[PDB]
């Protein structure tokens, strides 16, 4: 038998306490009041006395909502400490104005302050009420702050602190508490989140209450623009100064349910098709050829704006859509002339061909373009884009191919045929450059998916699943690098001159393969065909009749095509449907806040001409003040209809009906 | 029972640690009542953690 | 504007009508009284008046639970009609007592009656007291019955057919319609399951309902099943006779859930282990020693049992698991021989080897306990059993093995080189099948992973995704035959001779693929081959200068391609990953009952011995009865406990604090 007693032994109730908590339970008002004059006169019970569970004869008063018990016990003097928080945790109006007109066990640590606690449990009245006094929250340091008070306290006590800057950033990030007591409650709300965001990457632990917090912050800015009921109060909001000036603040905060929200949709689409009053109610017959139409002109429109800014033409370029139409109608025409660019091979460094001479003007315009943006935008911001780094490579590569070029222009001049060049003859590589300068340009074009419905959340779910993608190369790459390293310890004996070869040519891409694992950089190459099938089995034979050496070498081959391909493989399609069906819910949302951010880019003046043209306050914040406070109105009104559309509700009924028993059997009786 | 480790036990935490590893050992030794055994080692776990 | 209006008119209540009904709906009594006395003397109320949601005054009393107000309207003789019914579906005691003691729009169908409804309500207290008078239920006709009044039913109108059948087996079906007014809930509820289930297969519409009928019912016997608290019962309800003949009736109803019982499985692990007391718990290795050492052991155990089945040895072998292990080591050791049998073969019909000569006695035994089966089971269960099919495909291939063997002894003396032979030479005929029969016994191994606790539920899942490949194979050979006989159309025109081909070969099987759609049996293995890749491209060339025709033949090839590849394989990944998440939920009790199936193939006394050793009442009913009735009462309690731990119940609440309110204004007042 297992003998079963109280090891952590309490101070047990007597009869006379035990019965003046149950009379306080049931909420019979006559036996606790007799009861307290009894205790004034006999000192027979201790009105303070806990119960099993710990809690006293006011907390009892207080759980039950019993506000005629809490004053009868508060008007006698009953111990009141700490009280206060479980009225506010409790979101009992009447018991915190009770208690606010007035080392034991606590379920609130000790740095829970009453306006903290109220923040915590997002409650507008209660808030309001601790707010109508003097009441302050500390400020939290930053967040690499290396002052010495921060050093100080976390070597305390890590512990502690650290969930005292949970607890105040919980205050901080309470909705209620940023409607209340925040001159700006959009941005506030944009820079809080930001903030719990930096806080969560930089805290290893607790990142899921950091992350939740800066969610639920962005889902209320997102609220209270959710609350605008007028275009004049939605303009007002995006253009406040600290145009669309607070919607760039959205964006550089990361705000995409801000940014992706309908109203704010409907407003920049209206800004997006300038031109065209009626693109939203037409066929897609009429939009095609009306896209078709703008893009055959757009030279015509580039001259015009060339010419004369102000004319019916001149500033037809200005609008967005417009422009984004010509940019990309130059650039598909860059990409036809690159196609009609490979339609006398013999000359060392000839002089560039019609097609090269017009393909030119354009990689100048290229050039400018992104040196003007580098200078216009900034660094940090021009080095955040990815897309500017395919850019810049691609630049790089042209550079490299002019140069190359004028290079073989200017040191050779015979025509010597190209079966007797120089492996590193400066033609063959300004050519190859050239080629892979072609494939980036056009690979290129995967960013203007973003402008499509269909096409647009498609490329953030593959951009988001590259990064999986990313992850399984690494164990695939160590994988490979280990068996390229064994299978060319095994083979690399007996390599072979290529003069002994069948056609004298040496490595995996010859007609008969050979030699696919005598040098490291040969294996590795063998490895990467054998993933796709192209390399053949007999390349793991060798001239000797060395058996055992071939038959451990196609062991090695065997083990890494199970790895690479049974196992690796499936395991990467697992990892990509799991990531797919996750970013399958907010796939919307990001692909409309990467199309706002395109949008936005065709807004402004400069970078208006495509290449190759380029190288040829105080009423405003009152305003601003009046559609918060009517937004802020709104949303309080919207999320107290929402909450109030538990055990303890039943307690508490139950509560009610034992007092109003009580009391009618009193008066009757 | 986690009222009945808070209660009547030495050390709650050894005892949530052992208990859970029985219930496991059960778990793998009964064929049937698996999944019940699992919940209780579960259990015993989780308590562990919240205290 | 759109005018709104009522279209559908109604009789709209007067004054007096109006305020009576929220009297009624209040709970005011005395006000009600009032208004009944009044109306019996000036007939200025109508008593019977509707409300705008069709309810009368009794129908408001019942939905509120007033019982007072209830008794009220009834001793004034208000209309009654089908308010038994709304009592019934409430799920109130008093109401219906109330009304057991005593054409117009209705919400319940003409053909429900107070018991039917109060079936479909399952609710024991109302049914009990339905039952408690002399009520019947119409007996439902044959599934498939094709008398006079069900054809002149179903064509005179099939929608009210159909709801009066659905109602009827809802009736039945009922839980607490089992538990009472039944001799044999669980024969009851298995049968009335399977009917359920036949009746979903044959009614194409309402397949769903009756589906989720049938799941309750099996659902109701593995709860009564549930109930048993002791082995003597358990073992008392699965030996019942209407041993463990209960068990075996449940298997042929396939009751998963009833038979995979955690009780059961214990009694029937208890029963498959018979020699082992202890093998539940024991080391891995050392059931493995043990079962090794019965395996290799099981000649010894066999010729035991032959020559004195009555000793230590006879009858270890009739224990289940033991004769499990002793078939599984005859098979593998049949296997072993087949392994063998591969390793002079210029004799035309050569005699028999050493390893041919020790086979035979296992096919014979093998033959023999097949007919053996067949014989003692019966046709239909034989030919029920998917496993059969296989078996008799071996036999019969090994039987054309044997003949075909016997004839090229009896026909051929000479040794003559297999080089010349005929293409259909007997001996290699029979070493074809025989080489195929070899495959088939080896992969009879897979219906072994039943035994096994990680092998088994693998095995259920991947043999219910072989209805989802069954499915695609369809469609896969619809589209191959197109492209086949596009493919052959094309180029059937240009078919060489074997002699014009390099090496005498012709087709695909050669080194140098040829005539790959010259013929529509060699474009199918072509397309076929191309699945895998090992059709090369160059077999789209033909010999004469026909460059469009090329063409148009590599355009089918990759069209082809395409949609195998690419879109019916993706889509058949896609629907075995669908299919399989769908039965992984199951997979535990489709295991259970599958090894149940195959322990208790174990438990009969024929087919003791392996191949190819198999070729040299009153009282009970009471008992069960007894068991029964324990099991409906803890049933029945237990229920009632789940269902005890809705708008209406704040509706009740508040009715009867009005009616509080009243009573006391009245009695003080
Ligand atoms: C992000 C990209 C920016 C940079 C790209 C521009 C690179 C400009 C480089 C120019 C050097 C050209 C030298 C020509 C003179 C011949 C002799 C010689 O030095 O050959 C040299 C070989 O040099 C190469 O082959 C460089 C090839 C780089 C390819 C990068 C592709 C990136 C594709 C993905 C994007 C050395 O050979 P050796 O010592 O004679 O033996
Ligand atoms: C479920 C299986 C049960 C049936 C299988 C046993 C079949 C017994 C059959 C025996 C006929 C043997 C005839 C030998 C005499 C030579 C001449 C001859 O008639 O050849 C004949 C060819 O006949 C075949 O080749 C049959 C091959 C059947 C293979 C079935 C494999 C099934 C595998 C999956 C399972 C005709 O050829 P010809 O007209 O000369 O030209
Ligand atoms: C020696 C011989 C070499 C031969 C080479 C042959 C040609 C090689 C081609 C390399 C492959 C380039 C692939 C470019 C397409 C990437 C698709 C990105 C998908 C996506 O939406 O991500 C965006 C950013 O992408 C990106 O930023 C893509 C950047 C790619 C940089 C590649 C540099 C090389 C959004 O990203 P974001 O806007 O959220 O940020
Ligand atoms: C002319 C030259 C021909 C060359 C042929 C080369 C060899 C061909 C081999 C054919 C493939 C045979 C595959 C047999 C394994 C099937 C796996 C079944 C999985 C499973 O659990 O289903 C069970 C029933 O299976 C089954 O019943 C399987 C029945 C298979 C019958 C095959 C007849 C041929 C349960 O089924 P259940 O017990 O619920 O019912
Ligand atoms: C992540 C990295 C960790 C993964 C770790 C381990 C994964 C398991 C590795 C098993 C590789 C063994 C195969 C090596 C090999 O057989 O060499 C062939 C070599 C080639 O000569 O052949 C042999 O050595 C002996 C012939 C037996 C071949 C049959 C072996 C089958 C084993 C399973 C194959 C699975 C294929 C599944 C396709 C659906
Ligand atoms: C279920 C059945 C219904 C499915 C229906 C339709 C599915 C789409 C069919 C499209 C097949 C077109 C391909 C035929 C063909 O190109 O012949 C080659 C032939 C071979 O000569 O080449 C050509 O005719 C022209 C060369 C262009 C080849 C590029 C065409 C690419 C089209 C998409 C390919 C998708 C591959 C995806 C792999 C990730
Ligand atoms: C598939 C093969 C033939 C490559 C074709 C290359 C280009 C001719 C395609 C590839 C991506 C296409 C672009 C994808 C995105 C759009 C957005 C599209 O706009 C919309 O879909 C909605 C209306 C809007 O842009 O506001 C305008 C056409 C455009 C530039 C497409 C123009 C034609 C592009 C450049
Ligand atoms: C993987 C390659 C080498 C093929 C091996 C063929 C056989 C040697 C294997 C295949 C399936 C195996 C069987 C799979 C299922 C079982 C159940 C297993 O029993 C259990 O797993 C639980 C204990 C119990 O049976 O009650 C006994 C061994 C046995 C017959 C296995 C014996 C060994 C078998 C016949
Ligand atoms: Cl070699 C190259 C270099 C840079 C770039 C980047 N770049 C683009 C590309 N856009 C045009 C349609 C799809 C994206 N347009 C530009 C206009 C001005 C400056 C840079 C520009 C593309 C190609
Ligand atoms: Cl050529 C063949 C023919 C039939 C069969 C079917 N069969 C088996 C197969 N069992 C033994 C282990 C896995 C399933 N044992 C038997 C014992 C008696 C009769 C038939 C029997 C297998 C192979
Ligand atoms: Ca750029
Ligand atoms: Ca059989
Ligand atoms: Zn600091
Ligand atoms: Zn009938």
Same mark, same amino acid.
């Given at each position: 038998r297992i003998p079963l007693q109280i090891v952590r032994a309490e101070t047990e109730l007597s009869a006379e306490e035990k019965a003046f908590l149950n009379a306080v339970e049931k909420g019979d008002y006559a036996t606790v009041k007799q009861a307290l004059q009894e205790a004034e006169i006999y000192y027979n019970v201790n009105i303070n006395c806990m119960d /099993?569970?710990? @809690?006293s004869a006011l907390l009892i008063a207080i759980e039950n909502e019993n506000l005629e018990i809490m004053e009868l016990l508060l008007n006698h003097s009953v111990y009141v400490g700490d009280a206060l928080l479980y009225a506010i945790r409790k979101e009992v109006v009447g018991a915190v104005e009770l208690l606010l007109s007035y080392t034991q066990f606590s379920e609130f640590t000790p740095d829970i302050t009453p306006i903290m606690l109220a923040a915590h449990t997002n409650n507008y009245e209660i808030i309001k009420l601790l707010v109508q006094k003097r009441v302050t929250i500390p400020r939290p340091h930053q967040i690499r702050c290396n002052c010495v008070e921060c050093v100080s306290s976390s070597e305390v006590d890590s512990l502690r602190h650290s969930r005292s800057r949970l607890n105040i950033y919980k205050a901080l990030a309470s909705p209620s508490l940023i409607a209340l007591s925040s001159e700006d409650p959009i941005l506030t709300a944009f820079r809080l989140g930001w903030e719990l965001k930096e806080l969560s990457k930089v805290e290893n632990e607790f990142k899921a209450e950091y992350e939740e917090l800066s969610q639920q912050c962005k889902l209320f800015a997102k609220d209270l623009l959710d609350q605008a009921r007028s275009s004049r109060e939605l303009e007002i909001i995006l253009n406040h100064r600290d145009d669309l000036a607070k919607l760039k603040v959205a964006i550089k905060y990361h705000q995409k349910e801000f940014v992706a929200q309908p109203n704010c949709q409907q407003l920049l689409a209206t800004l997006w098709y300038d031109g065209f009053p009626g693109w939203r109610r037409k066929h897609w017959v009429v939009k095609l050829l009306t896209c078709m139409t703008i893009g055959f002109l757009f030279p015509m429109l580039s001259i015009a704006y060339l010419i004369s800014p102000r004319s019916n033409l001149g500033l037809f370029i200005k609008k967005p859509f417009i422009k984004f139409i010509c940019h990309t109608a130059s650039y598909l025409t860059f990409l036809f002339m690159l196609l009609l660019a490979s339609q006398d091979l013999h000359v060392q460094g000839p002089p560039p061909t019609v097609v090269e001479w017009m393909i030119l003007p354009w990689v100048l315009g290229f050039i400018w373009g992104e040196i003007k943006e580098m200078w216009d935008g900034g660094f940090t911001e021009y080095i955040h884009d990815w897309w500017n780094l395919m850019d810049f490579a691609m630049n790089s590569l042209y550079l490299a191919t002019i140069s190359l070029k004028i290079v073989a222009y200017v040191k050779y001049n015979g025509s010597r /045929? @190209?079966? #007797?060049? #120089?492996?590193?003859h400066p033609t063959l590589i300004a050519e190859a450059l050239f080629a892979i300068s072609n494939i980036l340009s056009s690979l290129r074009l995967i960013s203007l998916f973003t402008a499509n419905s269909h096409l647009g959340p498609l490329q953030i779910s593959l951009g988001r699943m590259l990064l999986d993608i990313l992850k399984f190369l690494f164990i695939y790459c160590l994988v490979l690098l280990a068996f390229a390293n064994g299978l060319n310890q095994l083979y690399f004996y007996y390599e072979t001159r290529a003069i002994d070869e069948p056609n004298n040519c040496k490595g995996i891409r010859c007609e008969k393969q050979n030699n696919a694992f005598s040098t490291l950089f040969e294996t590795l190459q063998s490895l990467f065909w054998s993933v796709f099938g192209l390399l053949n089995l007999y390349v793991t034979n060798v001239k000797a009749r060395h058996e055992f050496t071939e038959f451990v070498g196609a062991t090695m081959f065997g083990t890494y095509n199970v790895i690479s391909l049974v196992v690796l493989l499936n395991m990467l399609i697992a990892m990509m449907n799991n990531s797919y069906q996750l970013i399958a819910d907010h796939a919307d949302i990001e692909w409309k806040f990467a199309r706002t951010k395109l949008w936005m880019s065709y807004f402004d003046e400069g970078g208006t001409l495509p290449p190759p043209f380029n190288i040829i306050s105080l009423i405003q914040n009152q305003h601003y003040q009046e559609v918060i406070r009517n937004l802020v109105k709104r949303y309080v009104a919207a999320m107290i209809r929402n909450s109030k559309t538990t055990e303890e509700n039943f307690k508490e009924l139950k509560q009610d009906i034992s007092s109003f028993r009580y009391e009618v059997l009193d008066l009757l009786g």
């Amino acid at each position: 038998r297992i003998p079963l007693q109280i090891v952590r032994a309490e101070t047990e109730l007597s009869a006379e306490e035990k019965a003046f908590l149950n009379a306080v339970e049931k909420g019979d008002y006559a036996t606790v009041k007799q009861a307290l004059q009894e205790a004034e006169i006999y000192y027979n019970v201790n009105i303070n006395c806990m119960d /099993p569970l710990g @809690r006293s004869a006011l907390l009892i008063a207080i759980e039950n909502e019993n506000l005629e018990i809490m004053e009868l016990l508060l008007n006698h003097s009953v111990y009141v400490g700490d009280a206060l928080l479980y009225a506010i945790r409790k979101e009992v109006v009447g018991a915190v104005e009770l208690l606010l007109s007035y080392t034991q066990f606590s379920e609130f640590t000790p740095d829970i302050t009453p306006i903290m606690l109220a923040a915590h449990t997002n409650n507008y009245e209660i808030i309001k009420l601790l707010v109508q006094k003097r009441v302050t929250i500390p400020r939290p340091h930053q967040i690499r702050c290396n002052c010495v008070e921060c050093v100080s306290s976390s070597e305390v006590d890590s512990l502690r602190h650290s969930r005292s800057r949970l607890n105040i950033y919980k205050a901080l990030a309470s909705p209620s508490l940023i409607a209340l007591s925040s001159e700006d409650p959009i941005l506030t709300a944009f820079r809080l989140g930001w903030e719990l965001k930096e806080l969560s990457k930089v805290e290893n632990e607790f990142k899921a209450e950091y992350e939740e917090l800066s969610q639920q912050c962005k889902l209320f800015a997102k609220d209270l623009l959710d609350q605008a009921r007028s275009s004049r109060e939605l303009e007002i909001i995006l253009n406040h100064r600290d145009d669309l000036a607070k919607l760039k603040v959205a964006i550089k905060y990361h705000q995409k349910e801000f940014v992706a929200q309908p109203n704010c949709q409907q407003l920049l689409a209206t800004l997006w098709y300038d031109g065209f009053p009626g693109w939203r109610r037409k066929h897609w017959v009429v939009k095609l050829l009306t896209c078709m139409t703008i893009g055959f002109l757009f030279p015509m429109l580039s001259i015009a704006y060339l010419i004369s800014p102000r004319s019916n033409l001149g500033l037809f370029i200005k609008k967005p859509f417009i422009k984004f139409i010509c940019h990309t109608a130059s650039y598909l025409t860059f990409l036809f002339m690159l196609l009609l660019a490979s339609q006398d091979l013999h000359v060392q460094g000839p002089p560039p061909t019609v097609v090269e001479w017009m393909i030119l003007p354009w990689v100048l315009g290229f050039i400018w373009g992104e040196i003007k943006e580098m200078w216009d935008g900034g660094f940090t911001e021009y080095i955040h884009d990815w897309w500017n780094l395919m850019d810049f490579a691609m630049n790089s590569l042209y550079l490299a191919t002019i140069s190359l070029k004028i290079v073989a222009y200017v040191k050779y001049n015979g025509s010597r /045929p @190209r079966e #007797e060049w #120089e492996m590193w003859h400066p033609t063959l590589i300004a050519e190859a450059l050239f080629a892979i300068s072609n494939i980036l340009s056009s690979l290129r074009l995967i960013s203007l998916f973003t402008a499509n419905s269909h096409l647009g959340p498609l490329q953030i779910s593959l951009g988001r699943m590259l990064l999986d993608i990313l992850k399984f190369l690494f164990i695939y790459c160590l994988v490979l690098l280990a068996f390229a390293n064994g299978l060319n310890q095994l083979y690399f004996y007996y390599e072979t001159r290529a003069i002994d070869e069948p056609n004298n040519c040496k490595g995996i891409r010859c007609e008969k393969q050979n030699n696919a694992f005598s040098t490291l950089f040969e294996t590795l190459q063998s490895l990467f065909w054998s993933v796709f099938g192209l390399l053949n089995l007999y390349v793991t034979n060798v001239k000797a009749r060395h058996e055992f050496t071939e038959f451990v070498g196609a062991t090695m081959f065997g083990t890494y095509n199970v790895i690479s391909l049974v196992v690796l493989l499936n395991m990467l399609i697992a990892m990509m449907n799991n990531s797919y069906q996750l970013i399958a819910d907010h796939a919307d949302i990001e692909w409309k806040f990467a199309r706002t951010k395109l949008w936005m880019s065709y807004f402004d003046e400069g970078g208006t001409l495509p290449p190759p043209f380029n190288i040829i306050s105080l009423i405003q914040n009152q305003h601003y003040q009046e559609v918060i406070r009517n937004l802020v109105k709104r949303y309080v009104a919207a999320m107290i209809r929402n909450s109030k559309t538990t055990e303890e509700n039943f307690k508490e009924l139950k509560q009610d009906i034992s007092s109003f028993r009580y009391e009618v059997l009193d008066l009757l009786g």
